[PDB]
Design an enzyme around this catalytic site. Structure first.
Site, PDB file in Angstrom:
ATOM      1  N   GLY A  28      55.675  58.304  40.364  1.00  0.00           N
ATOM      2  CA  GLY A  28      55.381  58.965  39.099  1.00  0.00           C
ATOM      3  C   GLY A  28      55.352  58.016  37.919  1.00  0.00           C
ATOM      4  CE1 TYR A  32      58.705  55.531  34.236  1.00  0.00           C
ATOM      5  CE2 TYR A  32      58.488  57.723  33.258  1.00  0.00           C
ATOM      6  CZ  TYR A  32      58.409  56.879  34.363  1.00  0.00           C
ATOM      7  OH  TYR A  32      58.038  57.377  35.592  1.00  0.00           O
ATOM      8  CB  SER A  34      54.299  54.035  36.450  1.00  0.00           C
ATOM      9  OG  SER A  34      53.736  52.740  36.541  1.00  0.00           O
ATOM     10  CB  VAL A  35      58.785  54.906  39.286  1.00  0.00           C
ATOM     11  CG1 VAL A  35      59.758  54.796  40.455  1.00  0.00           C
ATOM     12  CG2 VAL A  35      59.517  54.796  37.955  1.00  0.00           C
ATOM     13  CG  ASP A 165      70.043  56.384  31.983  1.00  0.00           C
ATOM     14  OD1 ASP A 165      69.483  56.134  33.068  1.00  0.00           O
ATOM     15  OD2 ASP A 165      70.112  55.549  31.045  1.00  0.00           O
TER      16      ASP A 165
HETATM   17  C1  LIG Z   1      62.816  56.805  34.040  1.00  0.00           C
HETATM   18  C2  LIG Z   1      62.138  57.435  35.250  1.00  0.00           C
HETATM   19  C3  LIG Z   1      62.652  56.829  36.533  1.00  0.00           C
HETATM   20  N1  LIG Z   1      63.101  55.636  36.691  1.00  0.00           N
HETATM   21  C4  LIG Z   1      63.423  55.253  37.938  1.00  0.00           C
HETATM   22  C5  LIG Z   1      63.893  53.868  38.222  1.00  0.00           C
HETATM   23  C6  LIG Z   1      63.233  53.048  39.171  1.00  0.00           C
HETATM   24  C7  LIG Z   1      63.657  51.742  39.390  1.00  0.00           C
HETATM   25  C8  LIG Z   1      64.762  51.239  38.692  1.00  0.00           C
HETATM   26  C9  LIG Z   1      65.410  52.051  37.766  1.00  0.00           C
HETATM   27  C10 LIG Z   1      66.597  51.545  36.967  1.00  0.00           C
HETATM   28  C11 LIG Z   1      64.968  53.337  37.522  1.00  0.00           C
HETATM   29  C12 LIG Z   1      63.225  56.262  38.869  1.00  0.00           C
HETATM   30  C13 LIG Z   1      63.496  56.361  40.315  1.00  0.00           C
HETATM   31  C14 LIG Z   1      64.446  55.564  40.963  1.00  0.00           C
HETATM   32  C15 LIG Z   1      64.666  55.772  42.309  1.00  0.00           C
HETATM   33  N2  LIG Z   1      64.034  56.718  42.994  1.00  0.00           N
HETATM   34  C16 LIG Z   1      63.129  57.506  42.427  1.00  0.00           C
HETATM   35  N3  LIG Z   1      62.526  58.464  43.264  1.00  0.00           N
HETATM   36  C17 LIG Z   1      61.696  59.478  42.898  1.00  0.00           C
HETATM   37  O1  LIG Z   1      61.317  59.669  41.752  1.00  0.00           O
HETATM   38  C18 LIG Z   1      61.193  60.375  43.968  1.00  0.00           C
HETATM   39  C19 LIG Z   1      60.959  61.729  43.715  1.00  0.00           C
HETATM   40  C20 LIG Z   1      60.478  62.548  44.726  1.00  0.00           C
HETATM   41  C21 LIG Z   1      60.222  62.030  45.983  1.00  0.00           C
HETATM   42  C22 LIG Z   1      60.445  60.693  46.244  1.00  0.00           C
HETATM   43  C23 LIG Z   1      60.917  59.856  45.245  1.00  0.00           C
HETATM   44  C24 LIG Z   1      62.842  57.357  41.065  1.00  0.00           C
HETATM   45  S1  LIG Z   1      62.601  57.662  38.014  1.00  0.00           S
END
Ligand SMILES: CCc1nc(-c2cccc(C)c2)c(-c2ccnc(NC(=O)c3ccccc3)c2)s1
Ligand SMILES: CCCCCCCCO[C@@H]1O[C@H](CO)[C@@H](O)[C@H](O)[C@H]1O
Length: 337
Positions: A28, A32, A34-35, A165
């Site tokens: 998603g 901010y 994307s991931v 957070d």
């Molecule tokens: C601000 C919005 C976000 N940030 C992170 C993130 C990713 C990497 C490192 C850090 C500190 C935060 C996110 C994150 C981290 C770990 N796992 C996820 N997983 C998911 O979003 C997800 C949702 C549904 C199915 C499969 C996966 C998101 S979401």
């Protein structure tokens, strides 16, 4: 030496990452950044890789990036989100533009585990225990979460829990003082939230599902009662005081009857968390020692954080200064064991 990077177009930008991270697949995105989900061949872990968006676009973006990286680097606790890696493809500060953050891939939050159902008492003990354990650590760093809710609580299939957070209804778990813009907040604002979450896990029902701000507060006062004299004497706002004395007296409800059926130790703990006066709420440390958690409590494995230098919050620096400080933090990162 430096890792070998590869380039791949993902979420409409060129991602440049170390070859250890394989099979990037977007999860998603938003303002901010994307991931992407990925597999870390080096550790054998499924990870999430986040490419920050516009990290140094302005002073405020830059300070926010620095704040985020500092916090992530300081949080080292099983029940709090932490950092597996941070990297940049840049080879010098002069080339530094992009910041990538790596953490454990998470696939579910507390709402997904709960499904608007009653959990068993043993399950609630385990979940609440982990939340409080993480909160002791966070609070020991002189940090207050301020918006703890089920969507900020990651849980895997072994129901191991981590406080986030961010997310993977919004105000139902907020402390009443937070919704009334009180400032001077106590760390027990988070304990109010724990109480709301705990009540809902036990009963299968949101505790205070207000339609709006005033409705939320009306539901809260109906349970915990109108403010008593001890609380009123600490209110400096003359408008807030005269409004409060003008409400009809309501006693605190009998928690034993409200949560009838629940473990009486759970009820006792809820009575100590859901107190209107934030000064009289139980702390996370105190709650870990409460008889409800007897099967899980270990006073020698409920660790606290190193002192956390947040003096940077009070500083007004130039963009390139925040950028440089951020670059220092990237270069000095040491991965966890
Ligand atoms: C601000 C919005 C976000 N940030 C992170 C993130 C990713 C990497 C490192 C850090 C500190 C935060 C996110 C994150 C981290 C770990 N796992 C996820 N997983 C998911 O979003 C997800 C949702 C549904 C199915 C499969 C996966 C998101 S979401
Ligand atoms: C009408 C609804 C009244 C809500 C009263 C909330 C009282 C919260 O409690 C207050 O929190 C403050 C910190 O935020 C402290 O400074 C006060 O000492 C404490 O009593």
């Amino acid at each position: 030496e430096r890792p070998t990077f590869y380039r791949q177009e993902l979420n409409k930008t060129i991602w440049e990452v170390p070859e250890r991270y394989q099979n990037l697949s977007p999860v998603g995105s938003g303002a901010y950044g994307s991931v992407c989900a990925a597999f870390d061949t080096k550790t054998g872990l499924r990870v999430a890789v986040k490419k920050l968006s516009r990290p140094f676009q302005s002073i405020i973006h830059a300070k926010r990036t620095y704040r985020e990286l500092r916090l992530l680097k300081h949080m080292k606790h099983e029940n709090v989100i932490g950092l597996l890696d941070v990297f940049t493809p840049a080879r010098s500060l002069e080339e530094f533009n992009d910041v990538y953050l790596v953490t454990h891939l998470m696939g579910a939050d507390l709402n997904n585990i709960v499904k608007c159902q009653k959990l068993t008492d043993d399950h609630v003990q385990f979940l609440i225990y982990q939340i409080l354990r993480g909160l002791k650590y966070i609070h020991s760093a002189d940090i207050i979460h301020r918006d703890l809710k089920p969507s900020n609580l990651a849980v895997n299939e072994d129901c191991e829990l981590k406080i986030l957070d961010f997310g993977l209804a919004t105000r139902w778990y907020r402390a009443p003082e937070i919704m009334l813009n009180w400032m001077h907040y106590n760390q027990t604002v988070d304990i109010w939230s724990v109480g709301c979450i705990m009540a809902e896990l036990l009963t299968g029902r949101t505790l205070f599902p207000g339609t709006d701000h005033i409705d939320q507060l009306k539901l809260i006062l109906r349970l915990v009662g109108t403010p008593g004299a001890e609380l009123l004497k600490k209110i400096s706002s003359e408008s807030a005081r005269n409004y409060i004395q003008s409400l009809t007296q309501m006693p605190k409800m009998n928690f034993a009857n409200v949560f009838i059926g629940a473990n009486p130790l759970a009820v006792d703990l809820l009575e100590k968390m859901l107190v209107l006066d934030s000064d009289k709420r139980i702390t996370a440390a105190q709650a870990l020692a409460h008889a409800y958690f007897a099967q899980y409590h270990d006073p020698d494995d409920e660790p606290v954080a190193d002192p956390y230098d947040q003096s940077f919050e009070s500083r007004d620096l130039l963009i390139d200064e925040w950028k440089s400080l951020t670059y220092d933090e990237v270069i000095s990162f040491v991965p966890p064991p």
